[PDB]
Amino acid sequence: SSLPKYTPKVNSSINNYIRKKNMKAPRIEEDYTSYFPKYGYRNGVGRPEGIVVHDTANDNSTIDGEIAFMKRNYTNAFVHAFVDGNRIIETAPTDYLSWGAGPYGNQRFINVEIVHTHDYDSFARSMNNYADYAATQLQYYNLKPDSAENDGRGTVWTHAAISNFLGGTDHADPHQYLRSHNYSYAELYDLIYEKYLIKTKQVAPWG
Ligand SMILES: [Zn+2]
Ligand SMILES: [Zn+2]
Ligand SMILES: [Zn+2]
Ligand SMILES: [Zn+2]
Ligand SMILES: [Zn+2]
Ligand SMILES: [Zn+2]
Ligand SMILES: [Zn+2]
């Protein structure tokens, strides 16, 4: 195409594998629940400020199990979306907040969960799927990707970054989870950034 290829800012054999395989994220599915609460973000309904990277609390759950448990326990916690190696499922409308990152995170950011995977390919697909969903939301909300990890400013936040800069929570996901699969947030962010650039037609698509 007329567009330049993205130059990766982070060395990543897993990202290389994703790009070379030309992985295609699945369609975003809606699975909403009538009794979930619908409250605006701190700047209003329809005004999220960014997106949070979570991994699921359990290492052995399925996306279906996670969702069923959440519907039963929504007064304790619920999130906007789950991704695994096969599916992207939005469980609450992104124009309203969700209950996944403590009081301060919840007022600002879309909460997205990475379901755990147990093989190389499934893990790589789940990373592609998270990154694709995140880039889609940033594009839809006219937000630009900016990692908050080191200075507490921007639109892409790990739960760890929320804990560090905002408080109201102490979870450090997804760092240890990604490390256990020989990956990292730095690599995930580089993938989000590239996918955002592809979607906004600034760099060439894969193929
Ligand atoms: Zn709908
Ligand atoms: Zn979390
Ligand atoms: Zn495991
Ligand atoms: Zn949506
Ligand atoms: Zn495993
Ligand atoms: Zn920045
Ligand atoms: Zn957690």
Residue numbers in the entry: 7 to 213
Task: Recite the paper's sentences.
During cell division, these autolysins are responsible for splitting the equatorial septum between two dividing daughter cells. The highly similar AtlA and AtlE proteins consist of a signal peptide, a pro-peptide, a catalytic domain with N-acetylmuramyl-L-alanine amidase activity, three repeats (R1-R3), and a C-terminal catalytic domain with N-acetylglucosaminidase activity.
To provide a structural basis of autolysis function in S. epidermidis, we crystallized the catalytically active AmiE domain and solved its structure at 1.7 Å resolution. The AmiE protein adopts a globular, mixed α/β fold, with a six-stranded, central β-sheet surrounded by seven α-helices. The rear of the β-sheet packs against helices α4 and α7 and is shielded from solvent, while its front forms the bottom of a recessed area that is largely exposed and solvent-accessible. The recessed area, measuring about 28 Å by 10 Å, is walled off by helices α2, α3, α5, and several loops. Located at the center of the recessed area is a zinc ion that is held in place with contacts to side chains of residues H60 (β2), H165 (α5) and D179 (α5-α6 loop). The tetrahedral coordination sphere of zinc is completed by a water molecule, an arrangement often seen in the active sites of zinc-dependent metalloenzymes. The shape of the groove and its high degree of conservation indicate that it is the site of interaction with the PGN substrate.
